[PDB]
Amino acid sequence: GILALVTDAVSLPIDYDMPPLLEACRTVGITAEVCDWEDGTVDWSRFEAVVFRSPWTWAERQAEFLAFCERVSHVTRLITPMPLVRWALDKRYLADLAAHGVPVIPTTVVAPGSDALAAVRDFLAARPEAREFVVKPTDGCYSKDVQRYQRSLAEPASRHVARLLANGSHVILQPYVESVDRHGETDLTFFDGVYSHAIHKGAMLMPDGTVHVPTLDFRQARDADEDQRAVAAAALAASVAHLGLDLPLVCGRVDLVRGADGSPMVLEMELCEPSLNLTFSEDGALRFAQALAERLK
Template structure:
């Protein structure tokens, strides 16, 4: 049976991948022969594996073209989980517009492209409905809170400067109202394996009032049971993603990050279908659930290969 799996990380990220040790053990228990590999290791013969699972290749943020090139190469020789079209779509937060178009509640988002005038784009955004007292400026391609900043409305000049800096780097940018319920309630990140809800965590607010930006480290997280309304929005977001991408089977893994808006309704902050941290240390049994889903997917993949 084809049960040889590459768990993909990179040299710097492995030490902050707290899921990896749990997943490695759980894979072994589920009969999956898993090996930790760096996507940047030129000596790995990827075709040796039956599948390649993205876990913590987080150095991709500074190496996006190389990472996509590597994904394309791997996809040609062996199945990639999640598949490349999913990863590619999910790398860019423009996907929020696709989710909104499908009727999924998302954080209201304005998109600004390089070449646009930052001050004018900001004014137009702030004139929209429900903007609130503060706003958030962030790149559409980014991770780990990098380059995400929060500004009071009155600090429009500072916000425009940050926006202009990102645009000058050739990056697309999202403008959002700062949803301040996050200060008390945090965000809720829901984790799904094979389309089935596994567990959730609370992540505290990372954008502090003084402008400090925290990273989503382990101490920012705690176990939390997702509420019914959160489960419903997360499931709708995953369904909409699958429909948009024309997927025929549930995503092997996915994470949906929700915050509550000014009316208290859950809205999508982020959908993570590429290389999400899965907060497995916060949920007993989650690694085993994921490993079982992986084992089934591997079996299915080898059945399909044989029948070809």
């Protein structure tokens, strides 16, 4: 019952979770092997199951990674089955969350083939109150191609949008949530539908155009309040219901931001290959290994 933990050379160095996850696996008796999804020498048929941990370059070659996952599902069991994978790797899931009553950041999806500039202008027209907005691909991570713009910069942003559509990605337009500048965001980690821990992550989009990447210095242990955990758990339940999942998500991370209302709303959610912040909790890794141990029974 060897367990494959998927990563890739470029991403393994920033997967702070792998070291502690491997020890936890050791503690629950499961033999895990770290595998690069682009390593053609891997016989995926050898594994009992596979878990996608940090194949984070998928953001650079989405179709390629999705194809990889698809091919792997034929030779071995995926802890996160394909339906979940395709759905979790596209921020369009924010609309499904909204349909389930889960509070999310007002989100507008621009599909390939759309008029980039018109799309941006209609967006700003519908939200005359948004002083700034953000452009981002629905299929990305680690701040990839994410940018902040003052509403007067529609044309430049439309060019950013066009660049993304050209690569065949859907683009999401959202108003810039003002509280993020001073209160960043809160990322909650769950295991089998149960809250484990959270962290605070500083803002990534600087007013001066700088776009940061969530490195360790941008994170710190945080205790999510009732409301935040309540929203996070709703987002997860909505995901379980939407996909018809028989079991809770082995693990997941729900990122929340503060609205003007003060109440929390989902920024993004990671259910396929999330950074879990295991090293910021005293038993998060054990809870993850245990949840995995239950799936392998």
